[PDB]
Amino acid sequence: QDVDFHIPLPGRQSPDHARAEAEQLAWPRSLGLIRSDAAAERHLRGGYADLASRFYPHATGADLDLGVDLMSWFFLFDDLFDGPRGENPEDTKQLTDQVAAALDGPLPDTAPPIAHGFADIWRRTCEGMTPAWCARSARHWRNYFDGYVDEAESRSAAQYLAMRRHTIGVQPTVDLAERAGRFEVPHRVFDSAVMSAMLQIAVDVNLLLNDIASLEKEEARGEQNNMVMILRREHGWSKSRSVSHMQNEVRARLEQYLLLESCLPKVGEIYQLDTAEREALERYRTDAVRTVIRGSYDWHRSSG
């Protein structure tokens, strides 16, 4: 909670958010993901419908619900690896595969509820979008899953960031902004060195914000796979020099984000984007990439 940062983007949040936070439970309940009332309340206090409403400021009604549900599923799924299952590449994969199976076709009734939940989400993420968009999203989900498997394997900052960039969930998050918004950035521009650089900054910034906010919690339990802990190790720094340096890393990433944003008009020329395309890319910049950057910061300033 509350550490100062340099984030020059407009804070926004969906006008339909309250109604969204109110009906939050019907979904995870009906899919067996939350059984008892104390678990429901343990959920309400993570504040996932709030975060959804900042990542997806442009959404409403069922489109906002799909985001709320993604946010819920995200944390529910993450819990299942807090156990012993998290240090054995084979129990992780064991699970992973049953969830990732949903990307290829229908699931056997005997699949865990965390996998039927995911399928309900994906069935809704893709309906109405184009086949190619759909396939690009699926590719992203599979690395997410493999991210968890390559993490269980582990029993260096550049090595830490390396594995963390997949497990964080940013990309499939951003992908959902397109679906909720009902638009799609030009596929050829999505693959561009400039945009993927903007995407790598959204990811990096998110895990640095995240690692700072939860500093006192993972510390009390001995975890050494946290940016702060790792930064004192590699460099031999005091816990306060490790935190300032991260604020710096963020500040510098945000500076550059803006630099890249200015190269965007020229990038649209290079790809000879037409009028509609030039616009879908504008939406993507302001409604998907920006919101994932700012939404998280605004959120860590009250909830979760």
Describe the structure.
The chain is mainly α. It has a single domain (1-304), classed as Farnesyl Diphosphate Synthase, CATH 1.10.600.10. The chain is 70% helix and 0% strand. It contains 17 helices and no strands. Helix 12 runs parallel beside helix 17 (275-299) and helix 14 packs across helix 15 (239-262). 31% of the residues are buried. It is classed as antibiotic biosynthesis. The entry lists the keywords antibiotic biosynthesis, sesquiterpene cyclase, lyase. The assembly is monomeric. Pentalenene synthase. The protein is pentalenene synthase.
Topology:
Elements lengths: L16 H6 L3 H5 L6 H8 L3 H8 L6 H18 L9 H12 L12 H14 L4 H22 L4 H11 L2 H12 L5 H4 L2 H21 L1 H6 L6 H9 L3 H24 L1 H7 L4 H25 L5
Organism: Streptomyces exfoliatus
Family: Belongs to the terpene synthase family.
GO molecular function: metal ion binding; pentalenene synthase activity
CATH architecture: Orthogonal Bundle
The 3D shape can be described as globular
The CATH topology assignment is Farnesyl Diphosphate Synthase
Classify the helix fraction into a percent range: 55-70%
Major β-sheet profile: none
Number of helices: 17
**Relative strand content:** under 5%
**CATH class wording:** Mainly Alpha
Which oligomeric state applies?
monomer
Query: What is the number of beta strands?
Result: 0
Count structural domains.
1
Structural class: mainly alpha
**What's the alpha carbon Rg, rounded to whole Å?**
19 Å
CATH superfamily name?
Farnesyl Diphosphate Synthase
Q: H/E order of the elements? A: HHHHHHHHHHHHHHHHH
The span between the termini is 9 Å
